[PDB]
């Protein structure tokens, strides 16, 4: 069979750039600046060791973002920022100050009725 999967055009908004990085899904970078991924053959995005927040989800952890001149990059998504709680047998941390935050939450209720 053919490589298939599908072509995928990774782009920052057309407003930002007209540059795109093409992802060939689930293929070998032969039959096509090239990089081989877990999700397939990616073209036109420079691999970046610096792991950042997942921005444009691609596959298998590969997440692309536009910033650095500039070029679309591809990098292993860092899940979260890292922390290690400083923990002891009697160590406790009790908040002395707080905030009151208003977080919008949005839900559908009904949809357009038709006949």
């Amino acid at each position: 069979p053919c490589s298939f999967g599908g072509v995928s055009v990774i782009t920052p908004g057309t407003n930002t750039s007209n540059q795109v990085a093409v992802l060939y899904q689930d293929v070998n970078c032969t039959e096509v600046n090239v990089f081989q991924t877990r999700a397939g053959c990616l073209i036109g995005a420079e691999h970046v060791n610096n792991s950042y927040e997942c921005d444009i989800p691609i596959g298998a952890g590969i997440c692309a973002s536009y910033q650095t001149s500039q070029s679309i990059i591809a990098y292993t998504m860092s899940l979260g920022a890292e922390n290690s709680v400083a923990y002891s047998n009697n160590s406790i941390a009790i908040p002395t100050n707080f905030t009151i935050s208003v977080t919008t939450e949005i839900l559908p209720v009904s949809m357009t009725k038709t006949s």
Partner: protein
Amino acid sequence: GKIQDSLSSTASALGKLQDVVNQNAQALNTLVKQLSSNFGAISSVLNDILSRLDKVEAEVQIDRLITGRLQSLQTYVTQQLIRAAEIRASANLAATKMSECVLGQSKRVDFCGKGYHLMSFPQSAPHGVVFLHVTYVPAQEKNFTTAPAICHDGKAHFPREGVFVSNGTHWFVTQRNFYEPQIITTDNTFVSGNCDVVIGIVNNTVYDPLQPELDS
């Protein structure tokens, strides 16, 4: 005030709503375009098949129109049913939040959004609802030595509510979600067991409200 700035420039936060309105008009569009498709018949105009041919042939063709269009409905319809239930579950969730969050105070965690929940203010939106969740988020923390228990005379003292803490010297019992130290007296602490069993009990002296009240 931050909310109104967000909405002022945010098209995305309504993505949930904007998607629902889209997906309907989408399938509505596609439903319409299916009126222009041949479906194998010689044309997608109903009458133009007729006036071209003598009807005993049209009876055959109009099948491939009907068989096509009738299907395209059942596709669209079966979609709506599925999509309806998707809204249906969302509507049930809205009733649950409207009921519990707004009309109550939700002990459930992160059902009303991050932080401990105070109240919610619903706001209507086209084919939807928008809650403003007012939540209580702690902020500034201070590392503090703690103990699960305090010996006094060999009795053990445990806090009624909150925990024994200490900056480094004076043991204070305080409520948990806010730092409000108070000197430790019997009204703060109840007696149980004795000093052997607890793991982590310290020494200290639990002041007595009553003892001074006597002395005169």
